[PDB]
């Protein structure tokens, strides 16, 4: 037997959500990535929320959904263009609750409804297994340069 999770509510990202989104993003990175990323890597990755206008522009100019529980934002994800999973960040206090899964299902429905046949994500090493269990297949190991740091990830694709 297994526990049955509730599905969180999802709503589009609003300009007023700028700060809570940046807060979920940095807390998710700090607290959930230690086994695959060193102190300095995590700091460069998180530092993206530093440029507030540009962090908010990336969100507002993409298809960005916010997961809520009791109306409190606990996670968000972002589709870029037709077929890129650009962002997936669940607050560290709310992981293991099918928030990530709910968010990603919404992005795949949204992307299918836009023509896309092959969804793609550059998955962080800690989220690699998560994506693989949902039919994403590792295609290419990469390094990304972020704020003067190098961080590994893997391009993984899913047929819709
Ligand atoms: C492009 C990008 O943005 S990639 C970068 C991705 N982001 C990050 O790495 C930031 C740090 N990480 C995170 O924020 C999160 O760990 C995420 C986003 C990867 C996933 O968020 P979560 O809400 O924990 O995902 P969710 O709960 O749907 O599933 C995670 C696991 O918990 C499990 N789970 C869910 N509910 C339960 C439960 N009641 N009992 C046991 N296990 C459970 C799922 O089976 C799943 O297993 P898997 O890892 O084998 O797939």
């Amino acid at each position: 037997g297994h526990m049955v999770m509730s599905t969180p509510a999802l709503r589009p990202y609003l300009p007023e959500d700028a700060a809570v989104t940046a807060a979920i993003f940095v807390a998710s990175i700090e607290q959930l990535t230690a086994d695959d990323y060193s102190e300095e890597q995590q700091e460069a990755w998180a530092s993206a929320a530093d440029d507030e206008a540009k962090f908010a522009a990336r969100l507002s100019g993409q298809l960005t959904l916010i997961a809520t529980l009791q109306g409190v934002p606990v996670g968000f994800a972002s589709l870029k263009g037709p077929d890129h999973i650009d962002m997936l960040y669940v607050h560290p206090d709310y992981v293991g609750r099918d928030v990530g899964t709910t968010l990603i299902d919404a992005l795949e429905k949204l992307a299918g409804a836009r023509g896309a046949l092959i969804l793609t994500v550059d998955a962080s090493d800690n989220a690699a297994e998560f994506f693989a269990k949902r039919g994403y297949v590792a295609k290419q190991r990469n390094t990304v340069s972020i704020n003067g740091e190098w961080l590994a990830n893997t391009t993984m694709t899913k047929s819709l």
Side-chain angles (χ1 to χ4, degrees):
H2 51 90
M3 296 289 95
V4 181
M5 301 301 319
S6 300
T7 314
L10 307 183
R11 55 173 190 83
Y13 166 73
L14 302 172
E16 317 87 82
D17 300 319
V20 311
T21 306
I24 286 158
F25 167 90
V26 327
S28 186
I29 292 163
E30 291 175 339
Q31 304 184 49
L32 304 162
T33 67
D35 299 333
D36 308 271
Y37 298 92
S38 62
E39 44 266 38
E40 279 196 47
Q41 290 179 303
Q42 298 173 316
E43 285 160 6
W45 188 354
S47 84
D50 280 0
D51 189 358
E52 300 187 10
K54 179 180 155 54
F55 189 78
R58 180 188 180 176
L59 260 37
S60 74
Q62 285 167 15
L63 309 188
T64 308
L65 288 163
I66 291 186
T68 39
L69 296 169
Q70 343 318 139
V72 58
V74 298
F76 77 98
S78 209
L79 180 83
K80 178 166 170 135
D83 55 14
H84 292 83
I85 297 193
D86 193 52
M87 300 187 290
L88 207 212
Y89 299 90
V90 179
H91 196 270
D93 291 325
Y94 299 91
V95 293
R97 278 153 108 145
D98 286 333
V99 174
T101 297
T102 301
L103 279 169
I104 298 316
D105 290 345
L107 295 194
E108 307 178 351
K109 179 177 183 85
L110 225 36
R114 291 171 102 281
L117 317 157
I118 302 150
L119 253 211
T120 177
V121 63
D122 288 333
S124 65
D125 290 1
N126 50 303
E129 178 75 305
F130 171 89
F131 282 102
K133 307 280 224 298
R134 322 292 194 287
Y136 290 75
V137 171
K139 292 321 193 77
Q140 188 49 255
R141 178 124 264 242
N142 329 292
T143 295
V144 63
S145 181
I146 301 172
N147 209 21
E149 287 274 316
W150 292 352
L151 274 80
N153 64 47
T154 316
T155 306
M156 312 189 188
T157 59
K158 188 190 182 171
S159 207
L160 262 33

